[PDB]
Amino acid sequence: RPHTVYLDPAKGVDIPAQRRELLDKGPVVRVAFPGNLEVWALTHDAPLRNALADESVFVRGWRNWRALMAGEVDPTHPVANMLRVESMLARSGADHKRMRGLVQAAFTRRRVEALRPRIEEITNELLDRMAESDGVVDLKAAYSFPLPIRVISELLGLNEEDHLTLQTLVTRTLSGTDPEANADAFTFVASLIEAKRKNLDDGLISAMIEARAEDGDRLSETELIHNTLLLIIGGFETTMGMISNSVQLLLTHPDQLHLLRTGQASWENAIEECLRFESAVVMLPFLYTTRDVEIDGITIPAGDAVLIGFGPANRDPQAYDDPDRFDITRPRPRHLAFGHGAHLCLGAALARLELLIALPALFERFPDITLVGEAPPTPTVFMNHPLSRPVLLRK
Amino acid sequence: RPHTVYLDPAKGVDIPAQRRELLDKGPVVRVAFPGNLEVWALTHDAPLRNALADESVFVRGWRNWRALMAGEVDPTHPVANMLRVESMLARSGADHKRMRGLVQAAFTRRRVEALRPRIEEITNELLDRMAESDGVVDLKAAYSFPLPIRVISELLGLNEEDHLTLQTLVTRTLSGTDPEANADAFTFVASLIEAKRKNLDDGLISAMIEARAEDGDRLSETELIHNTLLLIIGGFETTMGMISNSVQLLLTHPDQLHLLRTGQASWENAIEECLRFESAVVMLPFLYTTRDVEIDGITIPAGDAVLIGFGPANRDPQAYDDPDRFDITRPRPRHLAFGHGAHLCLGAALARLELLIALPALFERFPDITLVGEAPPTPTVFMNHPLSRPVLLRK
Ligand code: HEM
Ligand code: HEM
Ligand SMILES: c1ccc(-c2c[nH]cn2)cc1
Numbered sequence A, B: 001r002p003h004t005v006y007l008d009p010a011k012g013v014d015i016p017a018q019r020r021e022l023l024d025k026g027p028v029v030r031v032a033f034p035g036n037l038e039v040w041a042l043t044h045d046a047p048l049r050n051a052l053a054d055e056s057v058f059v060r061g062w063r064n065w066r067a068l069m070a071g072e073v074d075p076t077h078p079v080a081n082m083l084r085v086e087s088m089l090a091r092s093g094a095d096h097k098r099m100r101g102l103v104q105a106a107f108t109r110r111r112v113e114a115l116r117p118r119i120e121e122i123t124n125e126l127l128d129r130m131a132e133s134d135g136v137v138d139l140k141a142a143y144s145f146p147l148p149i150r151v152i153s154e155l156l157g158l159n160e161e162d163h164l165t166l167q168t169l170v171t172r173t174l175s176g177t178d179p180e181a182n183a184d185a186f187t188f189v190a191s192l193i194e195a196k197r198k199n200l201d202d203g204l205i206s207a208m209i210e211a212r213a214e215d216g217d218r219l220s221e222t223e224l225i226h227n228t229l230l231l232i233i234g235g236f237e238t239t240m241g242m243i244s245n246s247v248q249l250l251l252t253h254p255d256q257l258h259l260l261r262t263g264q265a266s267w268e269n270a271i272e273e274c275l276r277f278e279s280a281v282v283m284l285p286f287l288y289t290t291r292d293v294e295i296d297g298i299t300i301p302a303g304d305a306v307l308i309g310f311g312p313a314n315r316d317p318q319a320y321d322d323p324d325r326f327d328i329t330r331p332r333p334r335h336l337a338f339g340h341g342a343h344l345c346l347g348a349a350l351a352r353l354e355l356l357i358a359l360p361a362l363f364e365r366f367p368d369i370t371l372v373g374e375a376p377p378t379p380t381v382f383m384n385h386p387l388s389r390p391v392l393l394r395k
């Protein structure tokens, strides 16, 4: 007989409140959206981590959602549609392993470490441009967005003319209020691929195209498009989010930033605590139960859809002492900001490198940077980062 | 019996299509929104102009909305709430003239003429910053937004720290999908006033504070807040919109732009044709009939709410031959982009000067400027301007 959390991003977004309520309403909660869409969420660290590692019980892939294939839910509802896709993240077992295996090389810790000089160069160029500006600056537009999109652009083989197009596209797909986002994103990326087949390069999209051409069985056309999409979705928006979130947190905890700036504390650990404390991905659709599952005296029936509550789990007092305190010296937090199990973030080492470069460089160039104005949230209950991040670079 | 036009901006906005449908469906049409709200719209030039000039028959102000108090529409509906306010634009008669009169001085021809040096200076500084950038630039973020908000900031006495806050706040109020936008905007502006009382200055907000202090009957506290909000709503968003829309139009009509650049056509007339052709305000809530009014053989009952269709009226073939063609040489269009009658845009001369400075200066500095990427629309059925306007300055 579960508690219910009613969500509507049109009536504002409040991630801190949402995280609190999802955690408070036991580990297993019902989440009701607009339309007549109600689903489950798992929101405490221990049950969530357990579910995320047990893919025979909690499977990926919309074909497993009973109510969806039984016409009880509208397939065009944005939330029902968001992970109604054919990429690796919406697969389990051999299909996941096949697809993830094809692209893993490009994202290994060691490959990512070879990207450091170029990431430093892109970071330093951005800082140079910021130094030419004089008064209030949107950190998101100047810094947080351009850095990760440039980095993933070079890895994937994207074109600079599409960077702003992609920013809009991804926001729409993650809004959970845009019925046509997936369809428009698919047609967009299909065109990218068809342009790229004409003019190959040494980027990952070209390599995946080349891999399909060599062996059609290795990767279908639908998988090529959807996996390209997934890499685009993941590739910049969350790192962008995290840069802004991290700067907000460090400047609102000036003592901790002081430790970082004087070499008395670890940037790496601080970034892990930022990931836990203000996780850019609050929750995502879905896990689907393969059988009846009982948690805390509540049974989730076989075939039901379950939101993955990374954000509430990251504030769980069972997992962390004093969870609602930001503390960069805390024992390296084993957080779920990058998820857990088979679908643990492909890009996790790349994001960690990006943040490790971007965050100290910013404060080195602009030691007296301050937060000004308001930073209203992106209107989505799925993601947690600001629409804008106004700063003053010089006192 | 009137036709009905169903609008839902969540399912994607298309102002060109929307204007065509509104115009085509005779001058008097019903417009239905999601939830429980259906209203009227006047969408041809001649009946609209006539309504707008006749304030004893078509009054402003939500207390005149019979259906509202008859509980026939959802109150808290964003569209019902948008002009549920106490500013000059939501009043008629003595109250309108009192409130409008307090601020008119600052917007007369002679006052606006003294703003020219500063507008040119702001324009030239923005162009200097753009010249230090390299590849694709968002013209909106670099030029179209910062110019008007800086200009109105100086006139009103706003703080640069709030500029980006205001951009979001205004977008929310004009979305017509945000129930909490007016309330949050009022709270925000009430704080502005409380800050401003401490430190008065030479700007219009201070003058309105000073006016209330000297004679409380000249201006209530509610009126002070709502009118400050109104001036902020009006003060930059539409000029910003018009800059981008005008650049789109001139670069997609390169022959006409050529004539302007060689002194074979008038910038002033071109700007009037931009205003007519891609009017930034498509329609707004609410004339309310003071009696039964018959137009085109259709009676609008007393007390009913009527959308003001500036944009469809501006494409009316009865008002202009070949309305759907952009033609900077046409006789100066007598358009409704600024409205008509007692509420004719207080800022109209300021907007015309801003555009007259901004548009030629842009093309003089960046003669080979080119449109690239996508420019998706702001998601509102009320306003007509892009979310982003990617350009290459020095292709
Ligand atoms: C830096 C570039 C990034 C890329 C290219 C990227 C890409 C991906 C991909 C492809 C997956 C799916 C993995 C699989 O199915 O095996 C994934 C999962 C995930 N990523 Fe990322 N990601 C990046 C950064 C981030 C960051 C900074 C965060 C969080 C702050 C994040 C959060 C997640 C989460 C939570 C999942 C698991 C989703 C789930 O279990 O349903 N990612 N990422
Ligand atoms: C191109 C730029 C602009 C456009 C297209 C525009 C359009 C309009 C329109 C259509 C109206 C009439 C609304 C109605 O009748 O319901 C109006 C009224 C108004 N506008 Fe603007 N406007 C612009 C710029 C500005 C500026 C720069 C200001 C500066 C404060 C401003 C302040 C006002 C005010 C205060 C009113 C209400 C006047 C009254 O109630 O008497 N506008 N504008
Ligand atoms: C849908 C698909 C992938 C993501 C993602 C992966 N990594 C970051 N974000 C978010 C939403």
Ligand SMILES: c1ccc(-c2c[nH]cn2)cc1
Pocket: B089, B174, B233, B234, B235, B238, B281, B284, B345
């Ligand atoms: C609501 C109220 C006023 C406006 C306006 C007036 N002038 C510019 N914008 C827009 C929307």
